[PDB]
Amino acid sequence: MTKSKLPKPVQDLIKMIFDVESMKKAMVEYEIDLQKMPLGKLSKRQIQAAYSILSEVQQAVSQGSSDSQILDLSNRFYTLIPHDFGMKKPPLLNNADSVQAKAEMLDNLLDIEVAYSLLRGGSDDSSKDPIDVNYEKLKTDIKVVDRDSEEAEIIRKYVKNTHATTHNAYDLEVIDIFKIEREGECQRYKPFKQLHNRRLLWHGSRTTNFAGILSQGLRIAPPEAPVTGYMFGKGIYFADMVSKSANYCHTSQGDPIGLILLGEVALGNMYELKHASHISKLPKGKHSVKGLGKTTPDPSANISLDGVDVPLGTGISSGVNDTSLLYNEYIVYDIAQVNLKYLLKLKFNFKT
Template sequence: MIKTYLTNTHGKTHSGYTIDILQMFKVSRHGETERFQKFASAGNRMLLWHGSRLSNWAGIFSQGLRIAPPEAPVTGYMFGKGVYFADMFSKSANYCYASQTSRSGVLLLCEVALGDMNELLNAKYDADNLPKGKLSTKGVGQMAPAESKVTEDGVVVPLGKPKEEPSKRGSLLYNEYIVYNVEQIRMRYVLHVSFNFKGGR
């Protein structure tokens, strides 16, 4: 299932590389499952991608995914300071910042309790001030996986090939999902991958 999810959601606009999966692990961080339970009943739980630089992973594995501190400039966050996820593998893979000389990358697949989402077509830097009743933000892209699979425990895995959403004409090409409370996140899988770049980079 995970290999299908990865292969199908490699966007055509990210065609400058292919991916080899080197290692894949199922993970469970201490305490994460327990704190996640309060949001598990909120509904709309999805398995989503998160990529980051190699230098960040020691902190992520020891302390979990974190939200940027108050002093971090808000301009780097299209939808406010939160933890960002994608349903397109290659969108998250680009945040690994791999290169010809450093081809390794690490990505997470996380179960994210999104609940009722505040859907936005364009950037909103204060999106972390959610409307009442909303648990997350969805930056709606013009392309999205066409099909999903639901696991036995009710998690939606959007593993279909991307399809254009003609009614969605915002600034994003692909969907982004943002939560502002780390208790809505549960790490499920870690992937160690190798980037095979086409041509020189």
């Protein structure tokens, strides 16, 4: 029963990541029936089967098949994943929007099952602090960045400048800044180290998903996932506006604490797009996809950190007239193209 000697901000981060209740709330927010399907009953092969049904809906809508088939698959989805809408009609998976919503839901369900499997596995010893046991389950070095260092100065300027005016529901306060080093990730990222056009970008996600993000990195949606459920196909999505990525933390007024990622991304040749392009492979010679947004952080204020460009400029007009994106988007389709550097802990102070 040796109390953990880890830094207090790290211990708080471990407790917040490995909280079983936060997993249960996240499933309740999706209106999943926890009585007919509790958290311990979540299965990876069950989520993959739900991914396949979403893919069956995608192909039926395209091939002009029976919309009656699209009704049977919708009811199949709700039998596979038991929900509880009370007295309301469940949303019908009959169009592309419904597929994207349930695709995003299964991405968080797959990460929740990963966090719970990580928690209830391995070995156990009641002589060690549970905080110490969970920290080594992540297989990640986690150090607190000093508040007065130039790293924290640049990171704060990154959060300070790239908060979009459209995302007016809140403003962000940086609580903690962690310098993370995933086990073995640096060797995996080595072939992309001297690739040109490397940037430090944001990645937001649910807090419960970070037990798997630190354990296995940022993954691509499984093969069973429908490629049309994501705007630019099955890849890893990043942004340069801190508010665009913080929206994917799914932070509520009840739980206003968020976790966001700062990662070095080997972009290389950017396939610049303006609208949806559901692809799994890039054209030969390209290494990433950039969704051109109307507003881009000023390129004149670009600075470097460890040889990595940091687009912390104020948002100005990009010079792109016809685009379906308000802000930029960076997508890679190889997991080795990501090197996670920092992990931030943000307080969401919702306004107006």
